[PDB]
Design a protein around this ligand. Structure first.
Ligand code: HEM
Ligand SMILES: *[C@@H]1O[C@H](CO)[C@@H](O[C@@H]2O[C@H](CO)[C@@H](O)[C@H](O)[C@H]2NC(C)=O)[C@H](O)[C@H]1NC(C)=O
Ligand SMILES: *[C@@H]1O[C@H](CO)[C@@H](O[C@@H]2O[C@H](CO)[C@@H](O)[C@H](O)[C@H]2NC(C)=O)[C@H](O)[C@H]1NC(C)=O
Ligand SMILES: *[C@@H]1O[C@H](CO)[C@@H](O)[C@H](O)[C@H]1NC(C)=O
Ligand SMILES: *[C@@H]1O[C@H](CO)[C@@H](O)[C@H](O)[C@H]1NC(C)=O
Ligand SMILES: NC(=O)c1cnccn1
Ligand SMILES: NC(=O)c1cnccn1
Ligand SMILES: [Ca+2]
Ligand SMILES: [Zn+2]
Length: 595
């Protein structure tokens, strides 16, 4: 097949072609095909899309239309029967800090975003979907099954709107609908700087030639910076607290304030850029603002890349790490660096790592105040708890000293997310992320579980007994075929997450393959990979070699006590050292001599 380049893409892109820095949009990374990995293009299709009409209509759209002879089960019913659980006791990951979960969200937000279609500014279908749960066009409501408690308290459905797609916004009819990735596929700190020129500029402080990112002028964190407020209304952060009237933050990625710990991590990264830009000024007084910004940006990008590939991915992929992401061999322009559609669901393994509560901890890493621990749901789009309740330091301590939730075949997604999710423009803490995920899978025309099993060279269970063996769980496999009459129909998100975890990892074989291939690609096909010869000097690379999330915390908060290995489960005071013991980023090799 179909047009090799479908329209509706801004075409005003010229490549500098010698520029030592990334573009904001990701264009110009690949010299032979400059659009590859650029934001606001179609997600890559590793396999042909599968829609009930072969083109755009999701499986589950037409009641009579089956998938492989069987009706697909309601997303909310799969959620109720499989994904939910009551007892939060014993669910915590004994050897992963809460930061392990949080870094996952960060890296996802750097890589992909498929926003809901708009097409209704004065839109009343925004209410026709909300109010009356009537399916049509981009309204694809998540209907409650019979016996669902939400049917008694929340009406007939949860509203759900189909993801935006390429070229025209209005549906096309000859080639399979392609969803948009609104951010750059390259791991390049686009969640900090934006993926659009329009946003990247607003985020910058262009009042002073210091190459700084703009900061909050209203509020301060004991002399430390907050991100600026997004002053546009209606704002969901103001909504969740009428009295507080504290807006969401404004970051390079719009999702930054979805939960307090994500906002917290965005705060750390913004602080890091300004910290870096200041040092780069001392070393190079002659560098103008643009050079400073670009050079600090480039450093942070390297930081994110190294933390992700050196510290994070090995403890996600475990034994599969080396199988899918071998040691680096240089840049390869034949590699497609685009995030695939399926990856955006594969990376949602993180949803089962999120615990039910968030804690604030004082300087002895003990409960900060009388309500130190809070239910996760009271922290969706919550910025006031940061500004009016002790800044980000007590939250960072929690990130270090508390555990991620462990994925559990019996206890998949906490009810803080599965029953009490809050969504913007929507008013209640009554949504289901798991149901959303499944509905979204179908929205995006995902091939089924077995198609992806085949993709990864894995066996394709056809019977209850084959599925029991694959999952090593009789009860779970029974529930899955009871709902999906065949493992061919099992939505990839639940299928992949249902598999037991690989040795030393936190995902199954199917996911490790989908994640592994993707991360291998975003590295190998990134012309500005930090370790690609020429991007940095060798001396610079030696300096970057010693970055640590521990150091990031020390440099950018008033925390003085940190663990060496921030992602493993660390207990205070034993596993914690003084910041003085922690390697620092030696910026001296960035000194640029004139004469
Ligand atoms: C409390 C923490 C989290 C919350 C509240 C949250 C919430 C959400 C919501 C509401 C969506 C949009 C779903 C849709 O409309 O289709 C989403 C998408 C997503 N989530 Fe999370 N999430 C959290 C943590 C994580 C983590 C830890 C990871 C990975 C480690 C992750 C990975 C993803 C990915 C890949 C998407 C799709 C992004 C895209 O559009 O490409 N999330 N999440
Ligand atoms: C943009 O940068 C300028 C210059 O750093 C900021 O203005 C200064 O603000 C500081 C607070 O850090 C005040 O104490 C001074 O009056 C200013 N200092 C100097 C040396 O001029 C300004 O706040 C920044 N604007 C934004 C939106 O971040
Ligand atoms: C919304 O935010 C306000 C403002 O911080 C919260 O009010 C604080 O809560 C307790 C009283 O219950 C006190 O410790 C603070 O001094 C209060 N401040 C003010 C100005 O009242 C309030 O609890 C929040 N409400 C919700 C629903 O989140
Ligand atoms: C805890 O995790 C790290 C890897 O993050 C590993 O080196 C260590 O052996 C783990 N401990 C156990 C008991 O599995
Ligand atoms: C470069 O990428 C192509 C396409 O993915 C791959 O087939 C090839 O083996 C890679 N080159 C090297 C030297 O690994
Ligand atoms: N973690 C996420 O991918 C996410 C968080 N908040 C809104 C949308 N997506
Ligand atoms: N889906 C979300 O939770 C979200 C949060 N903030 C901006 C946009 N989307
Ligand atoms: Ca990116
Ligand atoms: Zn302080």
């Amino acid at each position: 097949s179909w047009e090799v380049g479908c329209g509706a893409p801004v075409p005003l892109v010229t490549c500098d072609e010698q520029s030592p820095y990334r573009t904001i949009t990701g264009d110009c990374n690949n010299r032979r095909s400059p659009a590859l990995g650029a934001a606001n293009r179609a997600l890559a299709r590793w396999l042909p899309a599968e829609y009930e009409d072969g083109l755009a209509v999701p499986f589950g759209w037409t009641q009579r239309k089956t998938r492989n002879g069987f009706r697909v089960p309601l997303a909310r019913e799969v959620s109720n029967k499989i994904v939910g659980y009551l007892d939060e006791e014993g669910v915590l990951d004994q050897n992963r800090s809460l930061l392990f979960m949080q870094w996952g969200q960060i890296v996802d937000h750097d890589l992909d975003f498929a926003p809901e279609t708009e097409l209704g500014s004065s839109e009343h279908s925004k209410v026709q979907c909300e109010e009356y749960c009537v399916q049509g066009d981009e309204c694809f409501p998540i209907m409650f099954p019979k016996n669902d408690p939400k049917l008694k308290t929340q009406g007939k459905c949860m509203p759900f709107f189909r993801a935006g797609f390429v070229c025209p916004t209005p549906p096309y009819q000859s080639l399979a609908r392609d969803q948009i990735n609104a951010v750059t596929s390259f791991l390049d700190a686009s969640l900090v700087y934006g993926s659009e020129p329009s946003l990247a500029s607003r985020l910058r402080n262009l009042s002073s030639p210091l190459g700084l990112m703009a900061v909050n002028q209203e509020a301060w964190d004991h002399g430390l910076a907050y991100p600026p407020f997004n002053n546009v209304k209606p704002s969901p952060c103001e909504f969740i607290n009428t009295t507080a009237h504290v807006p969401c933050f404004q970051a390079g990625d719009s999702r930054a304030s979805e939960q307090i710990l994500l906002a917290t991590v965005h705060t750390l990264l913004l602080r890091e850029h300004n910290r870096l830009a200041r040092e780069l000024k001392r070393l190079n007084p002659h560098w103008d603002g643009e050079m400073l910004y670009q050079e600090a940006r480039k450093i942070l990008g390297a930081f994110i890349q190294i933390i992700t590939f050196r510290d994070y991915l090995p403890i996600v992929l475990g034994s599969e790490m080396q199988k899918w992401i071998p040691p680096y061999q240089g840049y390869n322009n034949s590699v497609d660096p685009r995030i695939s559609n399926v990856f955006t669901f594969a990376f949602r393994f993180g949803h089962m790592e999120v615990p039910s509560t968030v804690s604030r901890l004082d300087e002895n890493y003990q409960p900060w105040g009388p309500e130190a621990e809070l239910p996760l749901h009271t922290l969706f789009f919550n910025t006031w708890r940061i500004i009016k309740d002790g800044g980000i330091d007590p939250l960072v301590r929690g990130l270090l000293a508390k555990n991620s939730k462990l994925m559990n075949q019996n206890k998949m997604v906490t009810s803080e997310l599965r029953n009490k999710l809050f969504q913007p423009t929507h008013k209640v803490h009554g949504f289901d992320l798991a149901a959303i995920n499944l509905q979204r899978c179908r929205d995006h025309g995902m091939p089924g579980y077995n198609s992806w099993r085949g993709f990864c060279g894995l066996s394709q269970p056809k019977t209850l007994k084959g599925l029991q063996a694959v999952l090593k769980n009789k009860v779970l496999a029974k529930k899955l075929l009871d709902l999906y009459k065949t493992p061919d129909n099992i939505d990839i998100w639940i299928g992949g997450n249902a598999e037991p975890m690989v040795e030393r990892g936190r995902v199954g074989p199917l996911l490790a393959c989908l994640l592994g291939r993707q991360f291998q690609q975003i590295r190998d096909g990134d012309r500005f990979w930090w370790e690609n010869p020429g991007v940095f000097t060798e001396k610079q690379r030696d300096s970057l070699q010693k970055v640590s999330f521990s150091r990031l915390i020390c440099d950018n908060t008033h925390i003085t006590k940190v663990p060496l290995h921030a992602f493993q489960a660390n207990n205070y005071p034993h596993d914690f050292v003084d910041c003085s013991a922690v390697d620092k980023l030696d910026l001296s090799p960035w000194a640029s001599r004139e004469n």
